[PDB]
Amino acid sequence: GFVAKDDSLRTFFDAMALQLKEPVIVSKMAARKKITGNFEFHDPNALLEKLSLQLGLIWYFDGQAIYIYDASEMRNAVVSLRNVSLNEFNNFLKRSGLYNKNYPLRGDNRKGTFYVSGPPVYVDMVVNAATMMDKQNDG
Amino acid sequence: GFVAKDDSLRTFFDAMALQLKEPVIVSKMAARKKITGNFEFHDPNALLEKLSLQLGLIWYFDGQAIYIYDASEMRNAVVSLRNVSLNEFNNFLKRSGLYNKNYPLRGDNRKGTFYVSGPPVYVDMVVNAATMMDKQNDG
Amino acid sequence: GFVAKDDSLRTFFDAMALQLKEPVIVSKMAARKKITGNFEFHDPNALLEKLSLQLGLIWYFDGQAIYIYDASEMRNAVVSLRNVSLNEFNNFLKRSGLYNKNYPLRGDNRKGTFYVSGPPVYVDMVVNAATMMDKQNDG
Amino acid sequence: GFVAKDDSLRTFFDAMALQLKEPVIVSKMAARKKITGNFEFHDPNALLEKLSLQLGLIWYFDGQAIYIYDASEMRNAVVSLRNVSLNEFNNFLKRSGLYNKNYPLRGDNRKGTFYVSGPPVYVDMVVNAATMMDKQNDG
C-alpha cells in the first residue's frame, strides 16, 4: 500500500491512482493539504470515504474519472421539478447511474421541489439532468 | 509482436498500426501516457479492447481509420427522436455499419429520446445521423 | 514492370503512369507514403485495386485521368432524390459511364434518398449529377 | 516527314504545321510534353487522331485554325434545348460545319436536354450555338 509521512494529498491520491484505471483529479484545495499514516490500498474507495470522516474530503466517480474536493467546496442547489415526479426523477438518476447514495437528494413528496447537495460535479450532474427532465415534459 | 518497455502509447499503437492497413490516430492525451508489457499482435482489436480494461482507453473504427482516445475524453449527448422510432434508428445505424456494440445507445421505448455515449467520433456520427433521420421525416 | 524498394507512391504510380496514356494524379497524402515489392505492370488497374487491400488507397478514373487518394480521404454525402427514381438515377450514371461498381451507391427503394461514398471526385460527380437530375424534373 | 527524338509537342506540331496552311495552336499543357518517333506527314490529321490514342491529345479544327489540347483539358457541359428539337440542332451543327463526329453530342430523344463534351473550343462552339438556337425560338 502506501505509508504517507506528511505527504501532500495529491501525492497520496496519486499513489492510490497507481492502483486505479481511471484518472483521479484532486482539487487544488485538497492538493495543498497533507496526510500521514499507513494506508492499505486494498480498496481506494474505502480510503476516499474514510477521509470524509478523517480529513473532511468529498468525492464523486462520474463513470470516467474520480473527482476529489474538499468538503468545504461542496455545492448546494435548489431545483424545482414541475413536470416530473420527484420519485420518478430519483429513479431516473438511479437508473442512469448518476445518483450517488453517499450524497442523497433532499426531496419532499408534499412539495414540487428538491435540494441538491454534493461535490461540484455531482451537483452539476443532478441539476443539468433535472433541467433536461423537467423541460422535456414541458408540453 | 511487440515488447513495450515504458514506451509511449503512440509508439505502441504505431507498432500495432504496422500490422494494420488503415491509419491509427491516437489522441494527444493517450499519446502522452506510456505502456509496458509483451503484446502479441495476433489481433490488434483485442489489444484495443484489452486496454479499455487495463488503461482505460476507448476507440472507434469508422470504416476508414481507428480513433483512439482516453476514456475521459468520452462524450455524452442527449438526442430527441420525434419522427423516427427509436428501434428503427437503432436498426438504421446497425444497417449503416455505424452502430458499435461496444458503445450501446441508451434508448427507452416509453419515451421519445435516447442518450449517446462514446468516443468523440462515435458520438458525432450517431448524433449527426439522428439529426438527419429525424429532420428527414419532419413533414 | 517495376521493383519498388522503399520508393514513394508517387514514384511508383509514375512508373505505372509510364504504361498508361492518361495522366495519373496522386494526392499529397498518398505521395508521402512509400511502397516496396516487385509489381508487374501487366494491368495497372489491378495494382490500384490491389493497394485498396494492401495499403488502403482508393482511386477513380473519370474517363480522362486517374485520381489516387488515401482511403481516409474518402468523402460521404447524403443526397435526396425527390423527382427521380432511385433506380432511374442509378441507371443514369451507369449509362453515363460515371457510376463505379467499386464504390456502390447506397440507395433504399422504400425511401426518397441515397448515400454517396467514395473518393472526392467520385462523390462530387455523383452528387452534382444528382442535383442536376432532380432539379431537372422539378416542375 | 519528321523524326522526333524527344522533341516537344510544340516542336512536333510546328513541323506538322509546316505542311499545313492554317495555324496550329498547341496548348501550354501539350507543349510541355515531348514526343519520339518517325512520323510521316502524309496526313497530319491522322497523326492528330493517332495521338488521341498514343498520348491522349484532343483537337478541333474550327475552319480557320487547329486547336490542340491535352485530353485532360476536355470540357463538359449540360445544355437544355427547350425550343429546338434535339435532332434539329444536331443537323443544324452538321449543316453549319461545326459538328465534329470525333466528339459526338450526347442527346436523348425522350428528354429535353443534351450533353456536350470535347475540347474547350468545340464545347464553346456547341454551347454558344445552342444558346443562340434556343433563345431564337423563344416566342
Residue numbers in the entry:
A (entry chain D), B (entry chain C), C (entry chain B), D (entry chain A): 34 to 172
What does the paper say about this structure?
The bacterial injectisome, or type III secretion system (T3SS), is a specialized syringe-shaped protein-export system utilized by many pathogenic Gram-negative bacteria for the injection of virulence proteins (effectors) into host cells. The injectisome can be divided into three major regions: the inner- (IM) and outer-membrane (OM) spanning basal body with associated export apparatus and ATPase components, an extracellular needle, and a terminating pore inserted into the host cell membrane called the translocon. The major structural scaffold of the basal body is comprised largely of three proteins that arrange into a series of highly oligomerized, concentric rings: two intimately associated proteins localized to the IM - PrgK/EscJ/MxiJ and PrgH/EscD/MxiG, and a third protein belonging to the secretin family of OM proteins, InvG/EscC/MxiD (Salmonella enterica serovar Typhimurium SPI-1, Enteropathogenic Escherichia coli (EPEC) LEE and Shigella dysenteriae nomenclature, respectively). In summary, we report the crystal structures for the cytoplasmic and periplasmic domains of PrgH and InvG, two of the main basal body components of the prototypical Salmonella SPI-1 injectisome.
The stoichiometry of the T3SS OM secretin has been a matter of debate, with numbers between 12 and 14 proposed and recent studies favouring 12 for the secretins of other systems. We therefore generated ring models with stoichiometries of 12, 14 and 15. Based on the docking results, the 12-mer model appears incompatible with the target region of the EM maps, having significantly lower interface energies and worse map correlation. Using the high-resolution map, the modelling converged on two opposite modes – a “helix in” conformation and a “helix out” conformation” referring to the orientation of the helix in the N1 domain of InvG. The “helix in” mode shows excellent agreement with our previous biotinylation and cross-linking experiments, and better fit with the EM map. Finally, for InvG we observed a loop (residues 95–99) forming a series of side-chain contacts with the adjacent subunit. Mutation of Gln97 within the loop (which forms a hydrogen bond with the adjacent molecule) to leucine – but not alanine - abrogates secretion (top).
